[PDB]
Design a protein around this ligand. Structure first.
Ligand SMILES: O=P(O)(O)O[C@H]1[C@H](OP(=O)(O)O)[C@@H](OP(=O)(O)O)[C@H](OP(=O)(O)O)[C@@H](OP(=O)(O)O)[C@H]1OP(=O)(O)O
Ligand SMILES: Nc1nc2c(ncn2[C@@H]2O[C@H](COP(=O)(O)OP(=O)(O)OP(O)(O)=S)[C@@H](O)[C@H]2O)c(=O)[nH]1
Ligand SMILES: [Mg+2]
Lengths: 170, 122, 748, 325
């Protein structure tokens, strides 16, 4: 068996809470208005091996919100989320990632960028290429998701567990 | 000490006796400091609460190097306190000790005038 | 600020050097800088400083070079525990350390584990959760099926967390035991030894809280069960596994259990370790019950695996059997396991690798069975005589053997004196060794009849070694240092010692080797103690020749403590001065020498010099009093006019030592001194460091000590000042000094 | 940060807590550290956004500090401008009174920062779009700075746009009747320089003409001549020609925190108390307590102070059987 933790970070009012809740239960609503700190548990099977994730929904940080330290010690996995329907959220995810790498030290850590709300094809303002390029600058994995395409959401979490799993060894 | 000072006075008395015992150490060490330590003893005692038991503890601590006749005022005030508390026997025996003689045994003779203040207290 | 960054760059460059000494010195310099020079700045600026230091930690850890990463690890180790463990510190340091643990170098892994342990002791609020991850991560690696390096690293980090941060590890104890034993059975020697060490640490953790647990812990029984499972014949049939490894693990586990149940045996082993080298020990009640329940099973297992010829198995058996003896001498004496125990010990004594610890075990066994061992003395003695050089003949002997003799004397001593008398001159034929001196010291402390011969033989040895001449009724630096140290320390009698000092007064105080000078000074100062006591105390036993020798030695010692530039020699020489010396230090020339020494560049030498002269002031006020006045004048001058806080605190420190050691001079100058100190306290701006105010407060208290009756007038102003300082919560201001001052003031 | 979260929770009811929270806050932003001060200014802006109507009695005091603290620094400038945006959203009815005190800072920002604060000036320009009723009076002072801003090539073209759509937006609410004819010539002058500017300049000119139609007819020939020289048309030209919910308690973690089965020593029990209080704050249903959790973790006495309230929330949130457990 194994245990892991994951912290989801990004601008407020983006896929963080919705994506987490879709993963853990499998339902999306407009409740759970702007959160403060939420914790959820889920067992997962990756590469034919068990993982126990304690997912953490974080309060959305703005461009000037100081980086909380509860997430800079024990998380060993970071989901960087930005809504594809807000360029400001995409700048904010840059700056929060920057503050994280500032505070977590140099250490190459499993980071993954997730552009959620891809189902809003009629309102997107960030392209797949933009996020892919930004992640490649970070050298982190990239994905798109929606709070109703639950399968992809599962993959998202799987990917981070894969992301640490491949990269923990080397 | 977390709740109130009134209950913490039962430990303030301990602090008092420890510090005064260090003062006994100093009194033994330095003859010239003896008078000033005696005066400090009197002052701090006057600054203490008027409790017979705690007074007895402090005075026993002070008695290690000082006989009663060297601090007649302190034992006179102690006897006065014992009289106030109703412990007439303790005050009477302390007065006899300070006098050196017991007028109860000498009812047919006047009081020993040699220590008039102690006679007044008796 | 640019100066700070440049100094950081110098530290980074120095720590990048592969030289271990250079890295250590750079780390210590950074430690000093952060401890003193960083505290002069605010806390947000301190956070920025930690950010810069973490950039320099990057710079040290940027390369994959083992030396560079070791230097970075030393950096992180140095920073932690010095200042408050701010959040950024703990976060960045933990993240950096997690990158290092699976390293291939065992040295880097050990350093990283110790760093993780001290980071846990950092005490920041996140600590309680931090370790809960690392332990877990470590435990996960124990569950891993491969990657010996990962298992090793997990084992060491678990050990360090258990040892250094017990409270937060005690909760994780329950999952710990599940995986620790699968870590123990790993074929790798190092992983097994480290894992049983972690088991040690956690078992002491369990013991520390077991008495208050109203319900017995199952951990000891579970560990015994895994031990026997290691000894299982059927379970040993698991292929892809060497039976010797499982037996070694089982023995190690039983050693753990015995030690935590046989704390007396650990005390004996600790005594031996202290003797050879030149902590708290607890015992578990429930483990004691378990061991006495199944002790014979342990003995049967140990004797069954005795026949194994693996060197490490033999080592463990020799390290374990004396533990059983200390645990239960009676079983060995009665059931006759003692016969095979002695036979095996003497049989493995003839192979070096296990012989070394076999001698330790022989001493332990001799103590444990303090009576029956007599029967085996004829054997042991001869073989130890064989270990020691015979009279005819590199003749370098292992230290451990000597230790055994000492311990062998602690139980059979009075019975074996008649052969110790023969065994003296062989060790004297071995040559100098710190173990030799220690064992001779212990034998002296045991039986005086042996003490006399020990003293005489050691005098002859020192006559041959240091003096190059026989006793009457190039040379290695370390050997001479040891010789002089033992000469000074251990007790002796006779006229010959006088000669020793005189030669050492002329040939070794001026020796070109620094350590030799320092040790010669210290030893001569020690050696003149009984002669000076006889001269001063026993005025009727005074020998003018001894007085002349004392004066000559002191004069040359002071010349050495004034001439040579290096600081340590002067510091040790001056500290060697004692009240015994004072009667002969008051002369004009010696007093002038001390006067000159007081004006030396180093600071602590000035402190000790002012203390010494103040102490001397009693007997000959004529020479010292005007010079004390002059030093007071200059101290006041610098305190008033020196713009560097360092100079001000130095001045205050000299004044404090002056008043402590020279009160009578200070009574007439009571007023101006206190006026100056009050003005110092009333200065609106503080110096760069708070040491100035601390020295001021200590000086105030030391002044009050003698001057209280007069100072009664001035008490109120300095009292309100002290009240203001205390009521300022943000000022540490060496608060013990402030309260010390307040107490002394009120008392005086 | 916790205070901001609580206000977000109590947006309707937070007014009652103004007199205690607000005053001393000002003091700290007066004496705290630079970066901390900028974060505090941003959080004060959020407070304004949640206190919108009721910060008037404190409004004056606030502007004093920012009048003192609007140094020509890029980061401080951006934060203060955002705070201006949130004020003008809040005090919309009354902000006219405090507008002139802040006018000179904005003038100096336009005039001096020929540096990447020009980008910051764009943010300032965004704020300008919201002062409508308040700025109806001081438009005469404020506009000509904007005029030189979008008429000067030296300023970066995005700044020129920002200014030009800023005047376009201000066309919708203010009075341009009398003077604004003159500022057409800058706009017309801008039409001679860059196509990207020319498009949105045509848009802004159309908006202004709509406002100025009657007045614009009198002096159209010069501008329409220049326009037809540039060969663009618009329809208006011809037209003129003719609160928070209760967070759900995770009973599992609540019981786990209370599980002191293996706490023995004094250190163990104190640690258990610490972890208990922190878990109670984390798992509390009341959003304000869970907000306080972070400071509690960074500050143990904070955890101790609200142990009772957090436990009360959790206990009220439990089932009878779970209550008995
Ligand atoms: O003669 P003392 O033992 O010193 O006591 C008495 C009196 O106490 P009595 O009720 O026992 O006579 C007063 O009360 P205490 O202080 O002794 O409790 C005392 O003090 P006060 O006048 O302040 O009450 C007063 O005078 P002094 O303070 O100098 O001791 C003193 O003499 P009197 O008998 O004349 O009152
Ligand atoms: N259509 C659509 N709405 C979404 C999607 N993701 C989130 N939302 C909606 O947007 C709003 C905000 O998104 P949400 O996921 O709740 O933000 P958040 O991360 O919880 O916000 P905070 O709690 O972190 S401050 C919610 O009302 C939610 O219903 C999505 O993929 N598609
Ligand atoms: Mg949320």
């Amino acid at each position: 068996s194994k245990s892991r933790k994951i912290a989801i970070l990004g601008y407020r009012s983006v896929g963080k809470s919705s994506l987490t809740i879709q993963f853990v239960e499998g339902q999306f609503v407009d409740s759970y208005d702007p959160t403060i700190e939420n914790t959820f548990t889920k067992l997962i099977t990756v590469n034919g091996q068990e993982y126990h994730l304690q997912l953490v929904d974080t309060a959305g940080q703005d461009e000037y919100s100081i980086f909380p330290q509860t997430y800079s010690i024990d998380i060993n996995g970071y989901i960087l989320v930005y809504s594809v329907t807000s360029i400001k959220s995409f700048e904010v995810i840059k700056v929060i990632h920057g503050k994280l790498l500032d505070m977590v030290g140099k250490v190459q850590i499993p980071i993954m960028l997730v552009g959620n709300k891809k189902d809003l094809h009629m309102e997107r303002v960030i392209s797949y290429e933009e996020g892919k390029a930004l992640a490649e600058s970070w050298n982190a994995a990239f994905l798109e998701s929606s709070a109703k395409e639950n399968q992809t959401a599962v993959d998202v979490f799987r990917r981070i567990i894969l992301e640490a799993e491949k990269m923990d060894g080397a | 000490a977390g709740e109130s000072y009134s209950r913490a006075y039962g430990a303030m008395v301990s602090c008092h006796m420890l510090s005064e015992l260090e003062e006994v150490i100093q009194y033994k060490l330095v003859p010239e400091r003896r008078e000033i330590i005696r005066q400090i003893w009197w002052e701090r005692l006057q600054g203490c609460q008027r409790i017979v038991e705690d007074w007895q503890k402090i005075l026993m601590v002070r008695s290690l190097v000082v006989s009663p006749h060297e601090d007649m005022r302190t034992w006179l005030k102690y006897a006065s306190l014992c009289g106030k508390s109703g412990r007439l026997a303790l005050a009477h025996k302390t007065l006899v000790l300070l006098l050196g003689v017991d007028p109860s045994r000498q009812l047919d003779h006047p009081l020993p005038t040699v220590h008039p203040q102690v006679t007044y207290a008796y | 600020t640019s100066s700070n960054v440049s100094v950081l760059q110098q530290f980074a460059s120095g720590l990048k050097s592969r030289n271990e000494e250079t890295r250590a010195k750079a780390a210590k310099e950074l430690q000093h800088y952060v401890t003193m020079e960083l505290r002069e700045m605010s806390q947000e600026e301190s956070t920025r400083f930690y950010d810069q230091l973490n950039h320099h930690i990057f710079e040290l850890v940027s390369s994959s070079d083992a030396n560079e990463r070791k230097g970075g690890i030393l950096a992180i180790a140095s920073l932690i525990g010095v200042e408050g463990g701010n959040a950024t510190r703990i976060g960045r340091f933990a993240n950096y350390l997690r990158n290092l643990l699976p390293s291939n170098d065992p040295v880097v892994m050990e350093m990283a584990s110790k760093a993780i342990g001290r980071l846990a002791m950092a005490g920041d609020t996140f600590t309680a959760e931090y370790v809960e991850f690392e332990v877990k991560r470590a435990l996960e690696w124990l569950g891993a099926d491969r990657n010996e390096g990962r298992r090793h690293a997990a084992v060491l980090v678990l050990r360090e967390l258990a040892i250094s941060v017990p409270t937060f590890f005690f909760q994780q104890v329950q999952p710990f035991f599940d995986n620790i034993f699968v870590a123990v059975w790993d074929p790798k020697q190092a992983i097994r030894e480290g894992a049983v060490a972690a088991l040690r640490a956690c078992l002491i953790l369990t013991t520390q809280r077991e008495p208050k647990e109203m319900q017995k812990p199952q951990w000891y029984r579970h560990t015994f069960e895994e031990a026997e499972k290691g000894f299982d014949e059927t379970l040993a049939k698991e292929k892809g596994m060497n039976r010797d490894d499982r037996i070694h693990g089982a023995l190690l586990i039983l050693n753990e259990l015995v030690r935590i149940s046989s704390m007396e045996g650990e005390r004996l082993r600790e005594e031996m370790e202290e003797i050879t080298q030149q902590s708290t020990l607890v015992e578990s009640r429930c483990c004691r019950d378990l061991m006495e329940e199944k002790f014979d099973q342990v003995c049967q297992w140990v004797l069954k695996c005795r026949n194994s010829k693996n060197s490490l198995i033999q080592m463990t058996i020799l390290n374990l059997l004396p533990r059983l003896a200390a645990f239960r001498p009676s079983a060995f004496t009665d059931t006759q396991y003692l016969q095979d125990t002695m036979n095996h010990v003497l049989s493995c004594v003839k192979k070096e690798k296990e012989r070394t610890a076999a001698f330790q075990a022989l001493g332990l066994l001799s103590v444990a069975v303090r009576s029956e061992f007599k029967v085996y003395l004829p054997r042991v003695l001869d073989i130890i005589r064989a270990a020691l050089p015979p009279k005819d003949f590199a003749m370098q002997v292992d230290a451990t053997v000597f230790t055994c003799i000492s311990m062998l004397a602690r139980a059979m001593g009075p019975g074996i004196q008649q052969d110790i008398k023969e065994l003296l001159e062989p060790m004297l034929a071995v040559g100098l060794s710190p173990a030799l001196t220690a064992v001779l010291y212990d034998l002296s402390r045991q039986i005086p009849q042996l003490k006399k011969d020990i003293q005489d033989g050691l005098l002859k040895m020192l006559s041959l070694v240091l003096m190059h001449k026989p006793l009457r009724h190039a040379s290695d630096v370390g050997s001479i240092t040891l010789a002089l140290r033992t000469l000074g320390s251990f007790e002796f009698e006779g006229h010959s010692l006088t000669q020793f000092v005189r030669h050492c007064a002329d040939h070794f105080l001026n020796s070109e080797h620094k350590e030799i000078r320092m040790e010669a000074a210290r030893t001569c100062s020690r050696l003149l103690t009984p002669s000076i006591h006889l001269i001063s105390g026993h005025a009727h036993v005074v020998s003018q020749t001894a007085v002349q020798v004392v004066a000559d030695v002191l004069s040359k010692l002071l010349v050495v403590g004034i001439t040579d530039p290096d600081p340590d020699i002067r510091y040790c020489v001056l500290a060697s001065l004692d009240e015994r010396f004072d009667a002969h230090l008051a002369q004009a020339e010696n007093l002038q020498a001390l006067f000159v020494a007081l004006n030396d560049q180093v600071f602590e030498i000035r402190e000790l010099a002012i203390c010494t002269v103040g102490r001397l002031s009693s007997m000959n006020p004529a020479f010292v009093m005007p010079f004390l006045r002059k030093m007071l004048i200059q101290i006041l001058t610098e305190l008033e006019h020196s713009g560097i806080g360092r100079i001000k605190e130095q001045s205050a420190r000299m004044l404090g030592h002056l008043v402590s050691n020279a009160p009578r001079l200070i009574r007439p100058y009571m007023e101006p001194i206190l006026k100056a100190l009050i003005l110092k306290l009333k200065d609106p701006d503080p110096d760069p460091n708070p040491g100035v105010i601390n020295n001021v407060l200590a000086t105030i208290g030391e002044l009050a000590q003698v001057s209280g009756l007069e100072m009664r007038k001035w008490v109120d102003e300095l009292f309100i000042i002290i009240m203001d300082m205390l009521q300022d919560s943000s000022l540490l201001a060496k608060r013990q000094v402030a309260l010390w001052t307040l107490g002394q003031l009120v008392a005086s | 940060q916790a205070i901001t979260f609580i206000f977000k929770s109590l947006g309707l009811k937070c007014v009652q807590f103004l007199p205690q929270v607000m005053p001393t806050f000002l003091n700290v932003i007066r004496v705290c550290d630079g970066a901390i001060r900028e974060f505090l200014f941003q959080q004060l802006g959020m407070l304004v956004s949640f206190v919108k109507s009721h910060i008037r009695p404190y409004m004056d005091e606030i502007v004093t500090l920012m009048r003192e603290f609007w140094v020509m620094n890029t980061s401080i400038q951006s934060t203060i401008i955002l705070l201006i945006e949130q004020i003008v959203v809040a005090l919309g009815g009354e902000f006219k009174l405090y507008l002139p005190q802040l006018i000179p800072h904005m003038l100096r920002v336009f005039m001096h920062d020929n540096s990447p604060g020009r980008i910051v000036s764009i943010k300032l320009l965004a704020a300008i779009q919201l002062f409508g009723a308040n700025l109806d009076d001081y438009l005469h002072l404020l506009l000509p700075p904007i005029v030189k801003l979008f008429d000067a090539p030296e300023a970066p073209l995005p700044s020129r746009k920002a200014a030009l759509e800023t005047v376009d937006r201000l066309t919708e609410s203010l009075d341009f009747t009398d003077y604004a004819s003159r500022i057409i010539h800058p706009i017309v002058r801008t039409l001679d320089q860059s196509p990207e500017l020319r498009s949105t300049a045509m848009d802004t000119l159309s908006s202004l003409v709509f406002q100025l139609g009657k007045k614009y007819q009198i002096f159209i020939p010069m501008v329409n001549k220049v326009l037809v020289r540039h060969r663009i048309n618009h329809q208006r030209y011809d037209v003129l020609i003719c609160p928070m919910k209760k967070l759900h308690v995770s009973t599992i973690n609540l019981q786990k925190a209370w599980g002191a089965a293996r706490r023995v020593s004094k250190d163990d029990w104190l640690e258990w108390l610490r972890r208990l209080s922190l878990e109670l704050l984390k798992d509390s249903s009341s959003p304000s307590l869970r907000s306080c959790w972070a400071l509690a973790q960074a500050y143990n006495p904070m955890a101790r102070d609200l142990f009772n309230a957090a436990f009360v929330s959790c206990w009220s949130e439990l089932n009878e059987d779970q209550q008995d457990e």
